[PDB]
Each structure stands twice: as C-alpha cells, then as structure tokens.
Amino acid sequence: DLVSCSYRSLAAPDLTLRDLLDIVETSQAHNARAQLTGALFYSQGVFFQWLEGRPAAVAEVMTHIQRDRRHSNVEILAEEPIAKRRFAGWHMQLSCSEADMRSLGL
Amino acid sequence: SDLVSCSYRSLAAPDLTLRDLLDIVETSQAHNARAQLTGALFYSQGVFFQWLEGRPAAVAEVMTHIQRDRRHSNVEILAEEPIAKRRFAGWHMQLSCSEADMRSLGLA
Numbered sequence A: 001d002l003v004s005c006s007y008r009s010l011a012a013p014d015l016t017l018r019d020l021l022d023i024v025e026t027s028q029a030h031n032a033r034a035q036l037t038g039a040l041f042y043s044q045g046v047f048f049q050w051l052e053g054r055p056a057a058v059a060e061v062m063t064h065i066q067r068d069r070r071h072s073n074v075e076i077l078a079e080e081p082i083a084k085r086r087f088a089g090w091h092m093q094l095s096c097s098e099a100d101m102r103s104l105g106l
Numbered sequence B: 001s002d003l004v005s006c007s008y009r010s011l012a013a014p015d016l017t018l019r020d021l022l023d024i025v026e027t028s029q030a031h032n033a034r035a036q037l038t039g040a041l042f043y044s045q046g047v048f049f050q051w052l053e054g055r056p057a058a059v060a061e062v063m064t065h066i067q068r069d070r071r072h073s074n075v076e077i078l079a080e081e082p083i084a085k086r087r088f089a090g091w092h093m094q095l096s097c098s099e100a101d102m103r104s105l106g107l108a
C-alpha cells in the first residue's frame, strides 16, 4: 500500500526566492513527520513535483498543495501505484538551478 | 505568435545509464535547435519531467517520438497547453541532473 502523485504547475508571476525557500521548508517539515518523500523541480516559473507515500498522506497534502496560491494551473496530477519509493532519504529534495535562484533574487 | 506547450512525466527504463542520458540530451539539443523547440528536462532517481514549447505541430511530432523511446516508459502527458510567451527561450534542452543522480546512473 504505497503511491505516487505527479503534477505540473505554473508558479505565481510574482514568486520570490523567499517564497521558494518557504515552500521547501514547510514541505521538509510536513513530509518528514507525515512520511512523504519526493522531489520539487523549479525553473523559470514552472514546478514539477513527485510525491510518494501512503495514499492517505498524499491525498492530505495534495488537497493543501492545490489550494496554495504560490502557483496555479496545478495540472493533471498523475496518480500511479508504486512498488517501492524513489526518493527514500529525501523528504523534499529541491532541484533549483543557480540561474533560477539568481532570478528569484532580482 | 503561435506557441503551445506540452508537459509530461516519465519513468526511466530500469537499466538507464549516464551515457543513455547524455545521448538523450545531445539528440534533443541537435533536434530541438533545428525545430525551434525550447524547454527543460529534469531527471532524478528514475523519474523524468519535461516541458516543451514550440509551434503546435513541432511539439506534436517530437512527442510521438519521445513516447516511442525505449529508454523510458509510462509517459503520462498534458494536453497541448497554449502559452503566451516562451519560458525557456534560448534553452533548446536545459538539463536538470543532480551530482547524486550523476553518480548513480554512472555506477555499473
């Protein structure tokens, strides 16, 4: 009994670096206790995310994530059953480039 | 003027190597440049996300091939989303691959 959820979203046009850092730090905290793992990819106003865990916990955050106003167009979440975890060890691995971080700075 | 965008998420074939990844990018670069396809590829831990932007038909034609590709599977796609402006202009194939992922894909 273990599942994954994959979505693509368009980051708020006004998204700052502070916003990104907040998203990451909350996720770290929640996924940690809530036993979720995965990765968050940001570049140039686009989010990809992969969440994995128990269907219960994923549904929990995914309802929260969708309400979140730091992005929009939260697009066809692809709910796949998984045999094993893919990001064991990463309660939230951010993947954000040096350029992208510079941008969100300006 | 007439730009659409396509997003998908893939599962890398379980025997995918660093060389494979490198082949996927160089092919993409060469092609996307000629086809005016811009976008980004993210790989980590067996997972691929990609965002492609360009004129409707170019996106459509590459996506048929991307889906044929044996180096991955379970290609869940996102209906041609129309876009105001490009987002990765200049980038024909911006790659996201961590140093850790680089280590693993390069093991055996």
Ligand SMILES: Cc1cc2nc3c(=O)[nH]c(=O)nc-3n(C[C@H](O)[C@H](O)[C@H](O)COP(=O)(O)O)c2cc1C
Pocket (backbone or CB within 6 Å): A009, A023, A026, A027, A028, A030, A031, A040, A047, A049, A051, A061, A064, A065, A066, A068, A070, A071, A092
């Ligand atoms: C792109 C994006 C990805 C997010 N991913 C997670 C996540 O994986 N885990 C999580 O707990 N919150 C994530 N969040 C934050 C939640 O949407 C939400 O802000 C928060 O978790 C719910 O309120 P809280 O601060 O009380 O926990 C994400 C937000 C954004 C915009």
Ligand SMILES: Cc1cc2nc3c(=O)[nH]c(=O)nc-3n(C[C@H](O)[C@H](O)[C@H](O)COP(=O)(O)O)c2cc1C
Pocket (backbone or CB within 6 Å): B010, B024, B027, B028, B029, B031, B032, B041, B048, B050, B052, B062, B065, B066, B067, B068, B069, B071, B072
């Ligand atoms: C994850 C992934 C992403 C790919 N992205 C592109 C791309 O954006 N542009 C491209 O021409 N080929 C891309 N390819 C390669 C194509 O699937 C396809 O194989 C190629 O364009 C035609 O065959 P070839 O590899 O022998 O040249 C990608 C392959 C994979 C597995």
